[PDB]
Amino acid sequence: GMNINRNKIVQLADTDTIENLTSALSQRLIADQLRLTTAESCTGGKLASALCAAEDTPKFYGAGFVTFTDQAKMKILSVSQQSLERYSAVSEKVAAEMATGAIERADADVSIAITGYGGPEGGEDGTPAGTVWFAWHIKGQNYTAVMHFAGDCETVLALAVRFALAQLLQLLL
Amino acid sequence: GMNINRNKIVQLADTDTIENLTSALSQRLIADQLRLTTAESCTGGKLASALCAAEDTPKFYGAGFVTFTDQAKMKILSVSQQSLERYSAVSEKVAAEMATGAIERADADVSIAITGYGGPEGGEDGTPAGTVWFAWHIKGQNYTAVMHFAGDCETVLALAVRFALAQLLQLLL
Numbered sequence A, B: 001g002m003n004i005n006r007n008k009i010v011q012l013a014d015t016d017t018i019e020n021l022t023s024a025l026s027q028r029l030i031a032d033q034l035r036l037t038t039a040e041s042c043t044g045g046k047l048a049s050a051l052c053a054a055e056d057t058p059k060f061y062g063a064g065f066v067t068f069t070d071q072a073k074m075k076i077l078s079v080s081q082q083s084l085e086r087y088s089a090v091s092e093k094v095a096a097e098m099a100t101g102a103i104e105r106a107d108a109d110v111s112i113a114i115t116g117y118g119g120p121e122g123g124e125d126g127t128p129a130g131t132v133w134f135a136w137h138i139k140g141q142n143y144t145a146v147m148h149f150a151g152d153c154e155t156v157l158a159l160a161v162r163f164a165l166a167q168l169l170q171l172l173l
């Protein structure tokens, strides 16, 4: 029996700054004695940077992976070649595998994965620019969400980082 | 004999901006058919993000590591615990092992590693804030240098990223 009270796509508010989100997230994971790891592609390391700028980072976060290419996803995060060929790197399946691959490599408890098209170009399969797939691993369970962000590449990547954090907060309720 | 010209330590200039250095590095690495990987700590993923912002990132860069803790440095990049106990995480020996460890995990040709004190705190062994150790791996050979940047943490981190990139370029000439 699946309870769906927490399945809300968070709507980012101006109060959901990187600073405020990592404030809430850091103290929550420290309180829960949980260790976070991250895997990202299009955001390039900016999610990791958000967490490394948080307070008391070493008490909950150590390992961040940036895997910009198909080969890096396959080698570092054990994303399967078959899944990339079937679905492309910007896909629900690959995001989920990046989240479980980071868990494995880092020996962590919680993870966040981001893979998307920052823009101006979209996918060869027609996936429009601004589409970003996300995945989170929490308590042995995996979650995914897709978003379609408006604006240029700088604006899309900044929203993806904030969304990745804010939605983990939602899933931790 | 070792030639000082070819192995000189660079000095940052105002024209050495991130876009100009990554553009110069991208052309040079693609021309040489070499693959780059990075390992960073205090810079938090800003080095990787600078490389993922450059043009044709997939042709020369795939895998970036953020290892913010001792546990991450040991688990992800095979930094030895004894080197951490002996020299601390902000040291020449740990920087060098982060560079070689990244080469191995990524199966890359070239690597940069950064570990340091962005500030305001230094090391509790007297190592002042602003000290950053660097390592570069090229063609089997490892190079190191320590830097003492002035300014606040944001200023120190941006200087480190520029110097890491600038020095890689000169070693590649």
Ligand SMILES: [Cl-]
Residues within 6 Å of the ligand: A016, A017, A018, A019
């Ligand atoms: Cl913000």
